[PDB]
Amino acid sequence: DTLTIGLQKKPGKGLGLSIVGKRNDTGVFVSDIVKGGIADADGRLMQGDQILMVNGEDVRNATQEAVAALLKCSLGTVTLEVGRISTYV
After folding, report:
1. CA dist., res. 84 & res. 25, Å (int)
2. From CA 71, how far away is CA 48, in angstroms rounded?
3. What's domain 1-89's architecture?
4. Three-state secondary structure along the chain?
5. Lower CB density within 10 Å: C or N end of the chain?
6. CA–CA distance, 79 with 87 (Å, rounded to integer)
């Protein structure tokens, strides 16, 4: 389950989310969505989503620090492809 999401990054403010790695799976995942922020207001991103691609760059095997730095250095519209992550039981 995959979605494209476009967040308009504004000067002096963040995108309004945090991201984290996992111990038993590769990749980077949405861990918090700041109430009030850009990610929250756009209304598509969810806690647990995997960030798969950022402005066309594949980051499925990237590190938390790498994706965070990328997002921090990006300007304007940031286009994210994300994967909704289900839990197997």
Report:
1. 14
2. 17
3. Roll (2.30)
4. CEEEEEEECCCCCCCCEEEECCCCCCCCEEEEECCCCHHHHHCCCCCCCEEEEECCEECCCCCHHHHHHHHHHCCCEEEEEEECCCCCC
5. C
6. 26
Q: Which of 17, 87, 79, 88 has its CA nearest to residue 54? A: 79
Technique used: X-ray
Resolution, angstroms, 1 dp: 1.4
Q: Which residues contact 59 (CB under 8 A, 6 or more apart)?
A: 27, 28, 51, 52, 53, 66, 67, 70
